[PDB]
Each structure stands twice: as C-alpha cells, then as structure tokens.
Amino acid sequence: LWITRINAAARQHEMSYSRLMNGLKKAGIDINRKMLSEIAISDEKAFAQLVTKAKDAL
Amino acid sequence: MRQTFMANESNIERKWYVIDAEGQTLGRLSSEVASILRGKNKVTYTPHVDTGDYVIVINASKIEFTGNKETDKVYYRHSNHPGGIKSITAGELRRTNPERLIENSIKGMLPSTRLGEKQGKKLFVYGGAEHPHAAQQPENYELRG
Amino acid sequence: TKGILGRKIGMTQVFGENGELIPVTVVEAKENVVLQKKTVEVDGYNAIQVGFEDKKAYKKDAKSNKYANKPAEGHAKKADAAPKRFIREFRNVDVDAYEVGQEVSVDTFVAGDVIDVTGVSKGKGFQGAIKRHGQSRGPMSHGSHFHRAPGSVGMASDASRVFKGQKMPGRMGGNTVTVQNLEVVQVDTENKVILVKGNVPGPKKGLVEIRTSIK
Amino acid sequence: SRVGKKIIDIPSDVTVTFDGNHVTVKGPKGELSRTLNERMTFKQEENTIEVVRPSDSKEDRTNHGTTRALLNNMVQGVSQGYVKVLELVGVGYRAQMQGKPVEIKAEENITFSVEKNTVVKVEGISKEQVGALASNIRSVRPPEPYKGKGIRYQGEYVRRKEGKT
Amino acid sequence: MKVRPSVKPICEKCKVIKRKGKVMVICENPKHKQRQG
RNA sequence: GGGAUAAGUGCUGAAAGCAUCUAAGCAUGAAGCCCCCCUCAAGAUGAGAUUUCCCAACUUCGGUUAUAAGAUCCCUCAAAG
RNA sequence: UUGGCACCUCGAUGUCGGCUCAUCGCAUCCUGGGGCUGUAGUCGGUCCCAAGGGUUGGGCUGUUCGCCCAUUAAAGCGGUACGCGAGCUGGGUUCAGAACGUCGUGAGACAGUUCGGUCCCUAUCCGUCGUGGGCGUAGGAAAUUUGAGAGGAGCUGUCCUU
RNA sequence: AUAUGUUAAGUGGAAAAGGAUGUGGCGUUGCCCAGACAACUAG
C-alpha cells in the first residue's frame, strides 16, 4: 500500500518511485516507506523539499 | 495497527475528465484509462473503497490498430446453447457500434469483483465529438505516454 | 399498406369460376377508426393506432372491463370517436394517407389481393411429448413398459447435464401465429365482412389482424 | 518486383493541373480525376513531369517506381486513345433444349440475337477501364478449344474433348 | 493445377513467383501449373 | 434479392529497363455466410428505455388526508385452465 | 483397430445388440462453385473450395457382421463410459435341470452343438420443460422501440417455344 | 528505462524429411561510362 501511494505522490513531480527511492538512498536519508507516505498525504509542502534533495543527488 | 490514513465516505473527491481517442492505439489508450478509473494516481488511494474519477471518450470511431488486426482479432461469444457460437472481426466491429469495442477493451483490464463492476460504470464512450455532460464541467486530460 | 382488424365468425364454402369448390373463412370487421399517428420526430418510427369493437361510456361503480371513464376515455376523447375494445399498430402502411379520426372501411381490399392473417392459437393446456412434438411411442406389446413417454435426455459422463431446449412436456397453445400468402375471395360492404380463402388461426369470436403480404 | 528502377519520365505537352492529394490532366479529351499517393511528392515545375523519391526504402523503391508510370499513361490517354481489335466467329450457338406437370420456370433455352458479329474496336482514354471493358466483353464467349469460337484476341489451340469432368 | 509440398520448374519455359505468400510456378503450358501448400 | 467473401478468372502495375492477378489499386465469383431478408418471445439493476391519457386535500406532503376503465377480496362463468 | 504398461475404482464405476431421443466433427455419399485431363456430345478420371440441410423399405444368417430383393438425388465415414437400461426389451452372453460328440480310471473338463430359465428404487441438490408469488425501477392504465436470444432455410419430374 | 541491432509472422504463443525469387550478415571473384546488365536480329 505505502509503495503505491508514494509512487502516485512522486509522479506529480515528473519522477518515478524507482528513481525517487534511488536518489533518496544516495542523498543519505533513512526515512521509512510508511513515514514517507504519511508525510506526502498530510504536509505536502514538506514532501516537495524531500524530492528536491533526491533530485540534487541524481 | 500504528497510524495509516484510510480514505472513506465524506472524504473522497471525484472529478470528471475528457480523453480524446484521435489516432491512438486501442490497447495503449485503454491501459491508461483503466488506472484513472481505479484511482491509482491519487495519494489517498485505498483498496477497499472507490477513489477513482469519471472518464469520457469523445471520438472513439477514429481509433486505429497495428498490422493486420482489423482483418483478424475475431471476437467470439457463446449463448449457452448447443452450437451457439457467434464471432465478429475487430475491423467490422469498428464500423458499427464502435463504442462497445472500447468499452469491452477497458472493461477487460478491471478486477471481476463487486467494486470492479461499480468502478466500470463510471466510463462513458461516444462516436461523435459532442457529449451531454456540460453540467459536470469536465476538463481535458493529456495522455502521459 | 392496407391494414384492418376483424373478428373470426366461422368457416363455410363458396363455388368459384368453373364450378370449383373453395373453403373460405368469414371475418367480420367494422367500426375501425384511427386513434393516433406515431411520427419519427416524436417517437422515431411511423405508425398508426386503430380501434375495433365499441363499448358503453361514463359509469361509476363498475368492477368489469366494459364501461367506465378516466384513462381510456380521455385518450379516446382526443379524436372524434368512442372508447374502443382492441387497439393495435401498423408500421407497414403510409402515415400520410390517414387522419386522426378517419373511418377505416373494408373497401380498401379488393377480390384477388394477397394478405397475411395474424392471431393467437386455441390452446390444449398441459400436453405430453407425443402431442406437443411429433414423437413416436414404443412397442404396445412384446413385454414392453415404454409407451407414450420421452426417451433419453442426454449422453453420459461427458457433458453431464441437459442442453437448453430438450423438447420435454409442457403447456402448448396460446401462441402468436401468422399465415402468409392468403387470398380475398369476395368483400361485402353491406354486412362489412371479408371472405379469406383458407383458415386463419384462433377460435370463434377471436381477434385477427390483416396486412398486405410483403413478398 | 523485377523491373528497371530507373524510369524515362518524359515531359507532358498536354495541360496538367495537380491539386496535391488529387491530380487531374485536362487536354483534348482528358480530364481524368484520379487520386495518387501522398508519400513521395512530385516536381512538376512546368510541362516536364518529375517526382521526388523521399525516405529511400524497399517500400519507397517500388512506390516511386509505380507513380512514375502511373501518370505516364494518364497524360498519354489525354492526347492519344488506347484501342484493341477483337476478332471472333458470329453464330449465336448457346446450350441445347430446342425451342425459343410444369416447365422449369415458363420458357427455356434462349441464345443471343446476333446484332454486331464483326471486329469490334473499343475507343477509350483510360487503359485500366479500357482493359476491363475489353476483357468484360471478351468473357461473353471464352475461346473454346474446338475451333476458337467466341470473342478473343488471337491465341487459340485446336482440341475436341470433354468426357472426363 | 497440381498442389504438392515440393514445387520445382519442370522446364526452362516455366517461371516461379510468389502470390499472397504462396510459391507458385506460373508456367506457359497449362499442364505445368503447380502451387505449394 | 442485398452486402462483403473462398477456390478461382481477370484489369492495370511496380525494388533483373521484358515479364508478372500484387507490393498499391479496379473487377468478377459459391447450397457460400454466421451478415441482410422472413417468423416468434424480449427493458435489458450496462437502476436505463418511449409515447398518449387520467389523478388533491390533509396540513411544515410528518403522509394526520387521499383520489385514478386504480387494484383486489367475494360471486355467475368459458374463446382459458 | 489387435496389442504393450498396471496409474483411479474389488465396504460393487453391473451389462453386447435392438427401441426412443440426441448433439458435434469433416478425412464430402447427395445438392453448389471451380481446375486439368492420353478431357468425342451425353458424360466422367482426378484435384481444389465448401458442412447448410438431407441421407429408404423388406428377406435371411445368430447377430455388432455380411449376403440378397426393390427403390432413391443419395442410401457417406466417425466422436460423445465402443452416446443413451434410477428411459424400455432379454434375443445374445448368461446360474442351479437335461441330452450328443470328443477328452479323462473317476469326480469332471471343452474359446463344442442343442431345449428350458425372477432385470429392485416414493427425485433432496444441480440441470432441463412449463407456470406463479415478492420486491426493484425512484410511476396508474393502455400502446410500443429492441439485435441481445431462438427457429427456418437451396429436393424431383415432365411441359414447351431460336 | 537507456544504448544499439534483428525480425513483419501476431513469429513470439506446438513437430520432421524436403521445398522456396523472404531477409540480414560475413567471406571468396567478373564485368563496369573503351561502356557491363535490361533493351534487342543475324544463318
């Protein structure tokens, strides 16, 4: 379930779950999939910043 | 059971969309519409409730295929009677009643459950380019190839 | 084209040219009046409603289909006519040669016209498999226990069930039959009756519809 | 598909009016409305005919080789006139029964009322249509192997057999 | 019109072509016409 | 009878300057054919269908009222069973 | 088809032919299109396409088999527990009686021949053929649109006009 | 998804002797604007 939600929320910033996950790991973030989804659902602004960090790590 | 948001009634917001089948592959188009109907592009997606939106195909009679699929790809159907097997080529099913050709195609990519049947009743296909749903104010939706 | 409703009286015989016997069927058809005119811009198909028998008008406490008012009355008040007993439709006649309130007479038909009669059958109620369908019975002697009964209804293991339409016993009768390629011996305007060469389906005092054969 | 790829493509002295999707050549008795292919474009700068060969592929190798000769006869029929000479024998023989409790649909056994029975010459502008009609009237009586009785061109072979299916 | 799996030119007057994805021997003689299939 | 069709017969025509039913195209052609035509039952929770006509006081239409060739219950019957 | 193997059934999967009723195939008997013939006309050798319907009464051998008589446009080959016995018969195979022939010292045996010999069941579930009650559509009475379904389809012989 | 190729049969998503003007690769030669190779006339 979590993976599905993340994929949908990560597809609103022209990105794919596989690409986002990869970037996050290279960035050094250790957030859980259950936590990542929870954030996206509520504070969407905070999620936007996270994506930026993952996009900077390519 | 820690904490996981679950969508339900008086919390789900369904919108309306208008997809154009002008020069689009049957299978390639149906696949995209299916996901939208189930609502797998929503962040608050839930499997035990319906969170999908309504889709409306405008053209549908200008749908094209690849190779000799208009001559082959027959559609069989039984009538539960000894020797009651009827068939019809896809090409001949596009000339007359082309709306059923798209309906079945998009209805074959949905789960065969109680929710699956209710989710398949939110699809409206036509043959011209004028739909009688101007009161819902549906907006255009570009296909994310 | 040329449609009309009548009642089946009986069956007689009439001698034609060159002393040739001809069995005919007396069909009484009177009080035929158009009640409506279905168009293609209001219904999507051209047709005309026609009545047949008459009945008494306004009546209060009346627990019988013979005389009252309200529903049927109003619809029959639209045109200049009285309440009708039977009502039918014809989508084979022209809807430009009729007018709401016209009187369809029996002068539309002429001797030597091919017509198609239509009506319900008599009815024999619950019948067996030897009467409903033309089936044969088993030996009446030679130590046999198989008489007027059906045989096998399927095969064996493979497809262990009965296919739809196994022709078993049941009610047989009330069915809509339509005889084609008939003939109008002679038409009478004095008693408003039509002589059809042959026999139409249905019992005595039954409703029958006549239409010009397409073929 | 064994034909000289290179085509002469001679110029057309007759008037030509290309409309892009459809090309019509009007002249002494031309005016033959016909829609050609839209894949390879043409280069009709003036009276001299010319066609471009875009893409350069197996399909374009034949498509470009067809249009070139597809318009050659088109303008050729607008100035000239394709005519074929048909020779045959005029008799009228056709089946057998003699005469021209119930007969097979009223009367039976009817041949043909000889009206022409001479060398016919079809006069047209479109070779395609000309050929069709020419063969259409040549199918009336296929050249029999007996004595070549029936509409034909010239080919004929002597024979007299029909006992085994 | 013979229909056998193997089709080879009998003489040099017979030519082989391909019509509707089928090997045929369009020959001049009418008794030398064969079709694979 | 109508529409495509099978085997097949063709007409033009091209990636060997010829040829060639073919790769475009134009025809013709079966009890073929399930298609259409003919006969019968049929509103389809893809709540669907359609047309014509008839029907109002209670009392915030809560139904306290209720009306409609509106339904029965009961009774004389048969073209029905 | 005759066989090879022995994986399901021995606290039972009980039966060869005929009768009644059926469905499906095509490797086509009849009807329909064609092609080529060492294919005179009739007519037919073979081959290709084609499954929609239709495919008979008797005598006899014990009959599935076969042989004959007379017809027919034709008397096609198969699959479904070698279709169908909680639908029928019991002729065949067949159990206790009894003869004949061969075999055995004998009780008896024989894929020899002959006469006689009890075939059980009130339909719960699915399935099929008919026929109603209850609700639902946001409806009281009529009259209907209908391509979803079923049925039916191409056999003969003369007459008479180049 | 990225990068490059192969296939036109729905091959993919059932077999063999054999047959074949399908197509892409590799090689090894024989002619080529003195003009091969279509086109064509001398016995």
PDB file of C-alpha atoms in Angstrom, chain C residues 40-185:
ATOM      1  CA  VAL C  40     -40.354   9.659 -36.476  1.00  0.00           C
ATOM      2  CA  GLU C  41     -39.665  13.142 -34.971  1.00  0.00           C
ATOM      3  CA  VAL C  42     -41.667  12.330 -31.771  1.00  0.00           C
ATOM      4  CA  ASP C  43     -41.276   8.509 -31.423  1.00  0.00           C
ATOM      5  CA  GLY C  44     -38.595   7.559 -34.007  1.00  0.00           C
ATOM      6  CA  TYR C  45     -40.877   5.348 -36.167  1.00  0.00           C
ATOM      7  CA  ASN C  46     -44.014   5.966 -38.318  1.00  0.00           C
ATOM      8  CA  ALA C  47     -47.171   4.001 -37.304  1.00  0.00           C
ATOM      9  CA  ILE C  48     -50.974   4.418 -36.781  1.00  0.00           C
ATOM     10  CA  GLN C  49     -53.156   3.119 -33.876  1.00  0.00           C
ATOM     11  CA  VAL C  50     -56.531   1.534 -34.887  1.00  0.00           C
ATOM     12  CA  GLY C  51     -59.533   0.511 -32.705  1.00  0.00           C
ATOM     13  CA  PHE C  52     -62.142  -2.234 -33.332  1.00  0.00           C
ATOM     14  CA  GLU C  53     -65.136  -3.003 -31.028  1.00  0.00           C
ATOM     15  CA  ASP C  54     -67.143  -0.284 -29.174  1.00  0.00           C
ATOM     16  CA  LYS C  55     -68.325  -0.151 -25.506  1.00  0.00           C
ATOM     17  CA  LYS C  56     -70.521   1.917 -23.104  1.00  0.00           C
ATOM     18  CA  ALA C  57     -69.161   5.299 -21.864  1.00  0.00           C
ATOM     19  CA  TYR C  58     -69.222   7.029 -18.401  1.00  0.00           C
ATOM     20  CA  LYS C  59     -70.151   4.761 -15.426  1.00  0.00           C
ATOM     21  CA  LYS C  60     -69.403   4.965 -11.645  1.00  0.00           C
ATOM     22  CA  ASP C  61     -69.208   1.719  -9.576  1.00  0.00           C
ATOM     23  CA  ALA C  62     -68.251  -0.711 -12.406  1.00  0.00           C
ATOM     24  CA  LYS C  63     -65.976  -3.686 -11.485  1.00  0.00           C
ATOM     25  CA  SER C  64     -65.772  -5.018 -15.098  1.00  0.00           C
ATOM     26  CA  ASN C  65     -63.857  -4.169 -18.331  1.00  0.00           C
ATOM     27  CA  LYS C  66     -66.955  -2.939 -20.257  1.00  0.00           C
ATOM     28  CA  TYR C  67     -67.993   0.619 -19.212  1.00  0.00           C
ATOM     29  CA  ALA C  68     -66.360   3.410 -17.097  1.00  0.00           C
ATOM     30  CA  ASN C  69     -64.230   6.565 -17.735  1.00  0.00           C
ATOM     31  CA  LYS C  70     -60.911   8.328 -16.784  1.00  0.00           C
ATOM     32  CA  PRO C  71     -57.777   6.848 -18.543  1.00  0.00           C
ATOM     33  CA  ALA C  72     -59.123   5.087 -21.698  1.00  0.00           C
ATOM     34  CA  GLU C  73     -61.979   7.663 -22.022  1.00  0.00           C
ATOM     35  CA  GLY C  74     -59.641  10.706 -22.256  1.00  0.00           C
ATOM     36  CA  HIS C  75     -57.259   9.034 -24.767  1.00  0.00           C
ATOM     37  CA  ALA C  76     -60.334   8.157 -26.915  1.00  0.00           C
ATOM     38  CA  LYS C  77     -61.663  11.753 -26.489  1.00  0.00           C
ATOM     39  CA  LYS C  78     -58.546  13.148 -28.287  1.00  0.00           C
ATOM     40  CA  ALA C  79     -60.060  12.055 -31.651  1.00  0.00           C
ATOM     41  CA  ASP C  80     -63.795  12.204 -32.581  1.00  0.00           C
ATOM     42  CA  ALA C  81     -64.548   8.555 -31.613  1.00  0.00           C
ATOM     43  CA  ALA C  82     -65.932   6.425 -28.718  1.00  0.00           C
ATOM     44  CA  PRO C  83     -63.932   4.048 -26.411  1.00  0.00           C
ATOM     45  CA  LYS C  84     -62.510   1.065 -28.402  1.00  0.00           C
ATOM     46  CA  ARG C  85     -62.172  -2.579 -27.183  1.00  0.00           C
ATOM     47  CA  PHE C  86     -58.999  -3.680 -29.078  1.00  0.00           C
ATOM     48  CA  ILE C  87     -56.048  -1.439 -30.161  1.00  0.00           C
ATOM     49  CA  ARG C  88     -53.085  -2.317 -32.469  1.00  0.00           C
ATOM     50  CA  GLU C  89     -50.345  -0.604 -34.572  1.00  0.00           C
ATOM     51  CA  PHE C  90     -49.255  -0.857 -38.263  1.00  0.00           C
ATOM     52  CA  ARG C  91     -45.735   0.236 -39.386  1.00  0.00           C
ATOM     53  CA  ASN C  92     -46.206  -1.061 -42.984  1.00  0.00           C
ATOM     54  CA  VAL C  93     -48.944   1.406 -44.130  1.00  0.00           C
ATOM     55  CA  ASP C  94     -48.249   5.039 -45.216  1.00  0.00           C
ATOM     56  CA  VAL C  95     -48.788   7.646 -42.418  1.00  0.00           C
ATOM     57  CA  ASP C  96     -49.638  10.386 -44.993  1.00  0.00           C
ATOM     58  CA  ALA C  97     -52.905   8.830 -46.303  1.00  0.00           C
ATOM     59  CA  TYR C  98     -54.694   8.833 -42.890  1.00  0.00           C
ATOM     60  CA  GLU C  99     -56.101  11.416 -40.400  1.00  0.00           C
ATOM     61  CA  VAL C 100     -56.699  11.074 -36.600  1.00  0.00           C
ATOM     62  CA  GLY C 101     -60.454  10.252 -36.623  1.00  0.00           C
ATOM     63  CA  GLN C 102     -60.705   8.560 -40.066  1.00  0.00           C
ATOM     64  CA  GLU C 103     -63.017   5.516 -40.548  1.00  0.00           C
ATOM     65  CA  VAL C 104     -61.033   2.530 -41.984  1.00  0.00           C
ATOM     66  CA  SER C 105     -63.676   0.727 -44.135  1.00  0.00           C
ATOM     67  CA  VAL C 106     -63.408  -2.735 -45.826  1.00  0.00           C
ATOM     68  CA  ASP C 107     -63.380  -1.088 -49.314  1.00  0.00           C
ATOM     69  CA  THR C 108     -59.539  -0.805 -49.125  1.00  0.00           C
ATOM     70  CA  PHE C 109     -59.258  -4.537 -50.055  1.00  0.00           C
ATOM     71  CA  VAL C 110     -60.292  -5.960 -53.488  1.00  0.00           C
ATOM     72  CA  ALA C 111     -61.007  -9.575 -54.608  1.00  0.00           C
ATOM     73  CA  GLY C 112     -57.678 -11.193 -55.649  1.00  0.00           C
ATOM     74  CA  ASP C 113     -55.481  -9.398 -53.057  1.00  0.00           C
ATOM     75  CA  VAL C 114     -52.770 -11.410 -51.182  1.00  0.00           C
ATOM     76  CA  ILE C 115     -52.942 -10.742 -47.384  1.00  0.00           C
ATOM     77  CA  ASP C 116     -51.290 -12.151 -44.194  1.00  0.00           C
ATOM     78  CA  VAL C 117     -53.600 -13.058 -41.235  1.00  0.00           C
ATOM     79  CA  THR C 118     -52.208 -12.939 -37.641  1.00  0.00           C
ATOM     80  CA  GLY C 119     -53.722 -14.099 -34.302  1.00  0.00           C
ATOM     81  CA  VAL C 120     -53.190 -16.211 -31.129  1.00  0.00           C
ATOM     82  CA  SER C 121     -53.799 -20.022 -31.182  1.00  0.00           C
ATOM     83  CA  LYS C 122     -56.527 -22.012 -29.324  1.00  0.00           C
ATOM     84  CA  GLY C 123     -54.709 -23.878 -26.500  1.00  0.00           C
ATOM     85  CA  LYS C 124     -54.696 -27.535 -25.332  1.00  0.00           C
ATOM     86  CA  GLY C 125     -53.169 -26.795 -21.883  1.00  0.00           C
ATOM     87  CA  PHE C 126     -50.591 -29.206 -20.364  1.00  0.00           C
ATOM     88  CA  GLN C 127     -49.791 -31.659 -23.225  1.00  0.00           C
ATOM     89  CA  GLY C 128     -47.413 -34.674 -23.456  1.00  0.00           C
ATOM     90  CA  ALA C 129     -44.237 -35.157 -25.552  1.00  0.00           C
ATOM     91  CA  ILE C 130     -46.194 -37.279 -28.115  1.00  0.00           C
ATOM     92  CA  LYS C 131     -48.691 -34.424 -28.802  1.00  0.00           C
ATOM     93  CA  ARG C 132     -46.572 -31.239 -28.304  1.00  0.00           C
ATOM     94  CA  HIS C 133     -43.847 -32.628 -30.651  1.00  0.00           C
ATOM     95  CA  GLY C 134     -44.270 -35.346 -33.335  1.00  0.00           C
ATOM     96  CA  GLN C 135     -42.606 -38.206 -31.379  1.00  0.00           C
ATOM     97  CA  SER C 136     -43.201 -41.988 -31.808  1.00  0.00           C
ATOM     98  CA  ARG C 137     -44.294 -44.382 -28.994  1.00  0.00           C
ATOM     99  CA  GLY C 138     -42.595 -47.687 -28.017  1.00  0.00           C
ATOM    100  CA  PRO C 139     -43.901 -51.264 -28.603  1.00  0.00           C
ATOM    101  CA  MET C 140     -47.528 -51.643 -27.342  1.00  0.00           C
ATOM    102  CA  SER C 141     -46.890 -55.376 -26.619  1.00  0.00           C
ATOM    103  CA  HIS C 142     -43.981 -57.914 -26.601  1.00  0.00           C
ATOM    104  CA  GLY C 143     -43.491 -57.354 -22.823  1.00  0.00           C
ATOM    105  CA  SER C 144     -42.754 -53.600 -23.180  1.00  0.00           C
ATOM    106  CA  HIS C 145     -43.039 -50.932 -20.411  1.00  0.00           C
ATOM    107  CA  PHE C 146     -42.297 -47.936 -22.720  1.00  0.00           C
ATOM    108  CA  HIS C 147     -45.433 -46.275 -24.216  1.00  0.00           C
ATOM    109  CA  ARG C 148     -46.152 -42.504 -24.599  1.00  0.00           C
ATOM    110  CA  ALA C 149     -43.041 -41.350 -22.646  1.00  0.00           C
ATOM    111  CA  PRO C 150     -39.837 -39.484 -23.742  1.00  0.00           C
ATOM    112  CA  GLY C 151     -36.539 -41.392 -24.279  1.00  0.00           C
ATOM    113  CA  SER C 152     -33.017 -40.251 -23.259  1.00  0.00           C
ATOM    114  CA  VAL C 153     -32.413 -36.535 -22.414  1.00  0.00           C
ATOM    115  CA  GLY C 154     -28.578 -36.534 -22.677  1.00  0.00           C
ATOM    116  CA  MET C 155     -25.372 -38.608 -23.110  1.00  0.00           C
ATOM    117  CA  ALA C 156     -23.306 -39.770 -20.078  1.00  0.00           C
ATOM    118  CA  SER C 157     -20.180 -38.608 -18.136  1.00  0.00           C
ATOM    119  CA  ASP C 158     -19.036 -36.152 -20.876  1.00  0.00           C
ATOM    120  CA  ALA C 159     -21.236 -33.007 -20.546  1.00  0.00           C
ATOM    121  CA  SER C 160     -23.252 -34.481 -17.605  1.00  0.00           C
ATOM    122  CA  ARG C 161     -26.296 -32.127 -17.985  1.00  0.00           C
ATOM    123  CA  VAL C 162     -29.299 -31.358 -20.281  1.00  0.00           C
ATOM    124  CA  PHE C 163     -28.790 -28.846 -23.159  1.00  0.00           C
ATOM    125  CA  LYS C 164     -31.274 -25.912 -23.427  1.00  0.00           C
ATOM    126  CA  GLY C 165     -34.388 -26.938 -25.433  1.00  0.00           C
ATOM    127  CA  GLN C 166     -34.635 -30.698 -24.681  1.00  0.00           C
ATOM    128  CA  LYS C 167     -38.258 -30.762 -26.039  1.00  0.00           C
ATOM    129  CA  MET C 168     -39.995 -32.001 -22.825  1.00  0.00           C
ATOM    130  CA  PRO C 169     -43.731 -31.967 -21.811  1.00  0.00           C
ATOM    131  CA  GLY C 170     -45.392 -28.593 -21.003  1.00  0.00           C
ATOM    132  CA  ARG C 171     -48.272 -26.181 -21.804  1.00  0.00           C
ATOM    133  CA  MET C 172     -48.841 -25.766 -25.594  1.00  0.00           C
ATOM    134  CA  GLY C 173     -51.423 -23.463 -27.260  1.00  0.00           C
ATOM    135  CA  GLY C 174     -51.696 -19.659 -26.791  1.00  0.00           C
ATOM    136  CA  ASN C 175     -49.057 -18.636 -29.391  1.00  0.00           C
ATOM    137  CA  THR C 176     -48.949 -15.785 -31.980  1.00  0.00           C
ATOM    138  CA  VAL C 177     -49.032 -17.481 -35.448  1.00  0.00           C
ATOM    139  CA  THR C 178     -49.023 -15.615 -38.819  1.00  0.00           C
ATOM    140  CA  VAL C 179     -50.242 -17.421 -42.006  1.00  0.00           C
ATOM    141  CA  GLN C 180     -48.656 -15.901 -45.170  1.00  0.00           C
ATOM    142  CA  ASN C 181     -49.732 -15.722 -48.870  1.00  0.00           C
ATOM    143  CA  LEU C 182     -53.557 -15.940 -48.444  1.00  0.00           C
ATOM    144  CA  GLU C 183     -56.328 -14.561 -50.741  1.00  0.00           C
ATOM    145  CA  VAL C 184     -59.519 -12.394 -50.575  1.00  0.00           C
ATOM    146  CA  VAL C 185     -62.337 -14.348 -52.355  1.00  0.00           C
TER     147      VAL C 185
END
